[PDB]
Amino acid sequence: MDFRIGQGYDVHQLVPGRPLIIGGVTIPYERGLLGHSDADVLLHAITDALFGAAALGDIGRHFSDTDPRFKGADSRALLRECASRVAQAGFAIRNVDSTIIAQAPKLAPHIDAMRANIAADLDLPLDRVNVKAKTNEKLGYLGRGEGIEAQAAALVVRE
């Protein structure tokens, strides 16, 4: 009965010349996200929500860019290590919900693939992982296609 909630936010710039990787899925698009590794905005937000629910700080405190252990680590490896640390701190994950905000491309065809990657990385049943997607109605840098945002919420319980 010792439930805890966590919330996560991430954003990355979207420009020509890089791949678009969201939720572990490479998506064909004229632009891609800029960041240290694969720049997976959705997995970063979920990771931060999980560290937050466990009150373990955040993704920057756990996985520094200079650390040799995570030099070439992609964001799924980081999500899996996050989950291991959350479990070791005594918490079981109960569910994850999230939103991707991107003016383009359409993300609906890729939701089930993202959910399957996230559930596998968290060792969760598929029906405890949700990903939602929407545009920003052409408003702001998101609406002009200059960035993509992800939001995440996670519920855990201390066991």
Added chain:
Amino acid sequence: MDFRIGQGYDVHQLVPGRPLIIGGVTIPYERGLLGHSDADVLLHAITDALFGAAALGDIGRHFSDTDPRFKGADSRALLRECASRVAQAGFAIRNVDSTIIAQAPKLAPHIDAMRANIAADLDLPLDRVNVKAKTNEKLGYLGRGEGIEAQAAALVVRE
């Protein structure tokens, strides 16, 4: 004890010649929100939070903005159908919290009416529904009054 959390986000442009309908309340104003449905940004954010908590996808999955049957749709009717599907998936709603962010008009006079509408639609008492209203402190497209944003959080439990 099988609790789940969900989160929701929505935004719509503020334009001339549209009803301003937020939380089911038709608010007197020279502009209104632009969308395929009645464009109720607050009810959409809450709908997304509820679908997300039940791991049922999102409002685009259940009520496509491409579908003619939803042109001008009453978003309270959509919220009620969302709650019906969430119940059909086995979940009871425990509470909803939300934020509306707008430069104008003043929303304080309308918040209690919005809360009562949401509570009615979700078959909740008033004390389990909360609506918060704020400005964006003059920043960004929200500060310039180009759109209105809503955020939502929901807790459900699988019975």
Added chain:
Amino acid sequence: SMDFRIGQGYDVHQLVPGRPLIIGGVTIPYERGLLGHSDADVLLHAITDALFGAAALGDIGRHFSRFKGADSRALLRECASRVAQAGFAIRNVDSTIIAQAPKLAPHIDAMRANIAADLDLPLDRVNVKAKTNEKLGYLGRGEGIEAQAAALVVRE
């Protein structure tokens, strides 16, 4: 006791010259500070709104329109009092600060300690996270700082 409730909070304040930068009750050296009627502590405000939201007590604007000169930790303490008054116990708080500058990492642990003391919580039930905005929008240009918060309470 299984009557859990969640709340969510959002705040943003402009960064302006000639004012202290106070976030999570920590005074951070910086050329600018946050603009507000209070000390404009955007993180404490977001947490405050999340707590009012979880207890279904409305929001800051309704509670804190005898507080004319109060700093935001006093308001967070008052918020926690009202949450308790309504029969709720706070179970945990999580939050994110979005600021392009300055670096907040050295100050996070003090913010967490401040929030924990104000809410009468142990450290392991309070969390503060910090991000830039990748140089995007008004946050990325350093025109404001945003905070987000989530809170879990239970009605006893």
